[PDB]
Amino acid sequence: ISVRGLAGVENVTELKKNFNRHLHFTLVKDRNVATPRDYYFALAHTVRDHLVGRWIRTQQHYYEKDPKRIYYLSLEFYMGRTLQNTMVNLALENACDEATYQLGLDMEELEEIEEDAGLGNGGLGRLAACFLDSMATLGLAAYGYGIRYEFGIFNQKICGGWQMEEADDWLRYGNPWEKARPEFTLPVHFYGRVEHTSQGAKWVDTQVVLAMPYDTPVPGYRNNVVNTMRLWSAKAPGYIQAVLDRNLAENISRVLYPNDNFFEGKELRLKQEYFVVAATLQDIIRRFKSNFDAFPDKVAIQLNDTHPSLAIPELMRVLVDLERLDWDKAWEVTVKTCAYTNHTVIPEALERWPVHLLETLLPRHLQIIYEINQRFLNRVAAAFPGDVDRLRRMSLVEEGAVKRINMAHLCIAGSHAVNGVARIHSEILKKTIFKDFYELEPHKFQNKTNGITPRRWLVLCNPGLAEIIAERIGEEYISDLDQLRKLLSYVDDEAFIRDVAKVKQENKLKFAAYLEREYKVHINPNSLFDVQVKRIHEYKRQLLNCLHVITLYNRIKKEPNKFVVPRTVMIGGKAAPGYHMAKMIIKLITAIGDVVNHDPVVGDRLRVIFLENYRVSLAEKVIPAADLSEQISTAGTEASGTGNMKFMLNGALTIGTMDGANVEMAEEAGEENFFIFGMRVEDVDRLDQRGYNAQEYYDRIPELRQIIEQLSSGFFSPKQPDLFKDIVNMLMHHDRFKVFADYEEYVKCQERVSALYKNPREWTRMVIRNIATSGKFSSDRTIAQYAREIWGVEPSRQRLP
Amino acid sequence: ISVRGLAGVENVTELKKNFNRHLHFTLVKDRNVATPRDYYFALAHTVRDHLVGRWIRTQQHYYEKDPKRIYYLSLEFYMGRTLQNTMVNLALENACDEATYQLGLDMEELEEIEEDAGLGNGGLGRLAACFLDSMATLGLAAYGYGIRYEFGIFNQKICGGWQMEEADDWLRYGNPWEKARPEFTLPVHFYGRVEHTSQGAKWVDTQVVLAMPYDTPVPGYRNNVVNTMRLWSAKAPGYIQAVLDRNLAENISRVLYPNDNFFEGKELRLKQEYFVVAATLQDIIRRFKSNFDAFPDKVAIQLNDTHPSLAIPELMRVLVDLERLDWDKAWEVTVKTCAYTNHTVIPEALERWPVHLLETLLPRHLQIIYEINQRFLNRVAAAFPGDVDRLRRMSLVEEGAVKRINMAHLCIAGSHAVNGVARIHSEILKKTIFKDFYELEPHKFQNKTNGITPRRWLVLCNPGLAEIIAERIGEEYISDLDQLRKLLSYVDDEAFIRDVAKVKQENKLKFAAYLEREYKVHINPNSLFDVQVKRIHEYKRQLLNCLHVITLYNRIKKEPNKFVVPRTVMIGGKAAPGYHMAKMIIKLITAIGDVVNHDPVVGDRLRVIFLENYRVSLAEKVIPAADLSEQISTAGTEASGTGNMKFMLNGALTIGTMDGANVEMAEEAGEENFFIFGMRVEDVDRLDQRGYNAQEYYDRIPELRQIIEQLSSGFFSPKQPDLFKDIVNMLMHHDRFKVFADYEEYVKCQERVSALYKNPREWTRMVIRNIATSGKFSSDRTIAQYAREIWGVEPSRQRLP
Ligand SMILES: *Cc1c(COP(=O)(O)O)cnc(C)c1O
Ligand SMILES: *Cc1c(COP(=O)(O)O)cnc(C)c1O
């Protein structure tokens, strides 16, 4: 594969040398006792060495050049593995492949040893990871800042068809990429009280929690740029208990909260948020000094959701309390420095911290928040005199049994730019959700449609597809994905049609081999791979997919002799621990497979399997092997989505609603090349207006009725007939996401999917039309937009020495 | 200095190269931002690389050769720093000194950056450290096994004259010597219950705590041998709390219990003891397999006190329960494998675990302990028919309100050899303490007089003394200390007399510079350095030293014009957190200095200072600068001592009682070259027989009376007159260590010390007579004895390729 680079003779000689050097000096092993794991580490250290030169030169270059610096604050960085990605971006894949081969090793076997850096829940976390990659590839002096969770997203195990949660001990064998920096440790304060003296406020009597930075290299695509991702680790500042009690403060960075789009309100989570903000901003203020009028010209702080929103009052605290800037100048600086990115409209995702909890944990911040609110509302009152309810709606403070602070409101008030993550989402922010904020400051609202990196999500996971594409158009598309459009010229090319189809079958055979090897699960390779992989939530409607699967099963039993395109339906994703419904849903999926997968009448004509522990590395295996991409969220619920983009970039056809980025993907490729179905936002609203009555659908659709009765009677749970009563009850009477309402259109749409799959040539030509138009969804495009429209810096693909 | 080795041109070139390589690749720094700390680490990694080749070859050699293996189980390993020691044993000191010099660095400045591996309390821990060094130098296939405490002995701070305890975060900047081995992690079980089936007992329903090994290299003196010290680290095997709760099991290896010679009975301590035993023995059984009749021929398990005593029932558990050996054969194997080393006779040091606590935590072990006891007592009854009280005295089980298990009794019953740590101590074990065990099995009891390593304790800490010695007798003494005897030939050599005196003054100027630099404390360089450094306990009698200091002060005030040899009295050591008296004593020391050090009449004629945070690295600084070594424990209380040996090896004259190894040191050098004083064990016994009445001494000694009244009235605590009432009360009515009884002889003896110090020539000639006869106290001699008399292996100084 030519996109994998050259295997120079000297380069390969040096690689083997250093591989052996590390096995000896770093791992202290001989080839007599060395295990594949040792071999993976020897290679990892060898590859890591290649990053050091550029890593130091890059940061040095930024110091010499002094460009505006971008600080991307996020509570999650879903990075995945680093070995292949590092090799790809440094052009060392083939060389390492050859070197390890000469040493009698299978580099791919070694790559499977690496642990995912799963410091993210799903989309939001992964976007930050793709962003770091694009910001590096775009030559930006960007700094990712987050927290180094000791345990990332829990490793999911399926036991008895039920999800089981296990600690994700990802640092067990160490992390060869990060560089601990105990020397740059900073103090973070909690609790305490405020003293207002003759020099102003003073935050005193606080408990200290030290923040230890760990820096990880972020390589751009072959431009010799290596940026940094800084993750903070919590460190403590009779006798035995006191030493043991050091655990309490160090628990702050222990584990990533596994909630997806759901606000909890745990004090430990709030501490984690402030912890990353306080430390990060100390780093920022100091770097800046090595005056404050030019702060926004040299500093950009991007908030990934409201998680690090505390950076607004924190920046104010620093400038006013410690730097002695007058409130007004400080605020001008703050707003021009901060920008906020909203990721969802679902109300239960919004962060509204009880004022009492903020008053106790961060007394000085609450005071600053109240002051920010007064002046902000004062502005609203001056723009809309007499509009009292607007004041109540716009307020950062929410009244109720428990007074709270709306963090989204704080972010809008404290940032010069606010953006949605897809056109439809960004429009609704201005239309509904923040309509009032939009009317006050229209110029603040923007859109930055999400994207995925073509490196990890194409060249890395699909070397075969990337090769045949390069064969025709060169390698330039790799960091210029819009060039994929030149592929529309091959819709009638018999060679390309053959190859696209060939690559997809190879990926499917590979994924089949993976499942056979790791889980002993056998799937039919000559079946349509229908895949829905994403976090398990009601708004994503894995239940709608379940209804369809059962429909296919019942239709086969009713007319056995009737041919149907064979399908292997794969659903994967994690349910948040404690979310009862999401876990009942995972159980229904395995429960359906228990019947379906063992019916002799059905045989290998239909198979339903649940992909265990869906994570970044699994996404890289299954997505390139998918035929149909399921993106069936209820219209108006999925802000953007990114998994949809990955499936489009990898040769799968999409079946979905006009929601999130699905809309822009259909527009890019042409609605005729997308399997669009069901309600549109407007239709959902009309149902809401008159009230959603699931009974009507049940009453009017005999096939749906049959499935509800099978679930109800215990057809899919013979030993425990009433096992799914809650799913049934929710569907019939408390379904906020109208599953039944899109049932008919969905089943009909799937019929068309099968129809097209029956025609291999047309299936593939439509696929080509999809890949050829996925270009807009590369994160390089998104980041360039952030750079020019929000940060105020010009991106550049120019190489460093 | 010639004992420091050669500075080869190529060697120096390569060192600098690798130093720079590590600064770049390992530390990811440039010389623009590098700090001395970075420089220390760059050198440390560079030096560590030199150990790897031999480390792998040595272990490989032991595998090929298959010699009997020695497993030294200890709960403490007071290692101190590793950089200089590594350089010394590999002959790289001068080369590294030159290399770093050429790089513009002061290697000694860099050495001060290293953190002590203070995983020990005092003597017992340090002996294990010196033993590892000697076992390596003696070519033994020896393996040190312990626990990797996250926090070693607390760092002591003196605040307001009071000791303050701070966590000893020694791994904060990492440990460049150890090699983590997560791949060799083993499971350790706790709690649970026993199931007696048809295949015997089965330990089930236990909670698991994983033991992660960390291996540290142990270099022998220039023989190319590099053994291993294995330290185990505890690892865990709604959702958030469960992840946080992983801390509980990991707390097992968190911090070293700071008690010196005092049994507590904390369950966490018992868990730590079993943790090291279970893991260590798993390693031992496995290694052995890669049959059991030859186990004792291939395995030696040395127990450093009763801390790892659980290895006896644990070995039995393994052989009977898991290996299916009949009880009798298993026991024969066990006893022949285990040997026990007793370190103290003080009753409050003995480990007597409540049976209920053992029954709960290790149910199967208690059962085995009871079975061991029955059969053992059965043997006693058969050897002494009708002697019922002997049975009660020898029993492993102790009756009382709370039934307990005597671990010392378990160790004697389960080992083929039992030894004291000095001749006097070993004799009393046979005479009193274990008189009954001795009568049953006389052949079991031995003596292994302690020793210290001449490498760390001479060549390392006193390069000057080691140089002048080498100038006359060569370097052979370094690993053959008995050769120091050839120095008796220079008692009249004017050159040697000049040089010994010169070296001592250089060490004193250096220690003075240290105190000035680090603590801003100024000491008179032309004063007698009177030093007592050791853990703070009543039996060590720092209080006796205090009484003398006050005597000197009162005598100066009474006769100001009377010349007295100027003295800088230095007392240092840590008091166990919670030991009220030991801490009151530290306060009295600083309290005396507060008066003495500020009396204008006294001036620089007498100074009392408390050396803060006494630890291995401090011992290396102060001992070589000491004139008088204080070893004044009450006769019969200090089993051996090792600090005394260090002072003798380094040119200090000793003032002490006929206790522990003091006795053998006087015998080696000649009592006329030692300042021996006070009661002998026999005299203590007679006082005990009639009852110790401190009042008598108070009544008959006017000078002592004066001091007690000064303490009582508040002369040394004006702001709090009653501050020392407890010390006074204890001395007058509850002194178990008869301080007053040795007061007169002690003050008189100190008078003779001053008399001799007035004659520099004779002082030095007597010193020479001391250094020349310290040879017997090198740990190489002790270990060789252990090897031939207990382990059954022949030591060897032979070099490896
Ligand atoms: C891309 C990605 C996501 C996001 O998928 P959506 O379907 O947009 O929610 C979630 N998890 C992982 C492992 C991903 O790689
Ligand atoms: C040698 C040593 C000891 C033992 O000293 P003694 O006076 O025998 O009790 C204690 N602590 C340290 C730091 C040592 O080096």
Swiss-Prot record, chains A, B:
Detail which positions bind AMP.
30, 63
Q: Which GO terms describe its molecular function?
A: glycogen phosphorylase activity; nucleotide binding; pyridoxal phosphate binding
Q: Which PROSITE patterns match?
A: PHOSPHORYLASE
Q: Name one GO biological process term.
A: glycogen catabolic process
Where is the PTM N6-(pyridoxal phosphate)lysine found along the chain?
646
Keyword Acyltransferase on entry: no
What positions are modified (Phosphotyrosine)? 191, 214, 438
Which top-rank group of organisms is this from?
Answer: Eukaryota
Q: Site Can be labeled by an AMP analog: which residues?
A: 143
List the Gene3D superfamilies: Glycogen Phosphorylase B (3.40.50.2000)
Q: Which reaction does it catalyse?
A: [(1->4)-alpha-D-glucosyl](n) + phosphate = [(1->4)-alpha-D-glucosyl](n-1) + alpha-D-glucose 1-phosphate
Subunit field text: Homodimer. Homotetramer; to form the enzymatically active phosphorylase A.
Q: What does this protein do?
A: Allosteric enzyme that catalyzes the rate-limiting step in glycogen catabolism, the phosphorolytic cleavage of glycogen to produce glucose-1-phosphate, and plays a central role in maintaining cellular and organismal glucose homeostasis.
The family note in this entry says: Belongs to the glycogen phosphorylase family.
Which NCBIfam families does the UniProt entry name for this protein? P_ylase (TIGR02093)
Name under which the protein is recorded? Glycogen phosphorylase, muscle form
The organism encoding this protein is: Oryctolagus cuniculus (Rabbit)
The organism's taxonomy opens as: Eukaryota, Metazoa, Chordata, Craniata, Vertebrata
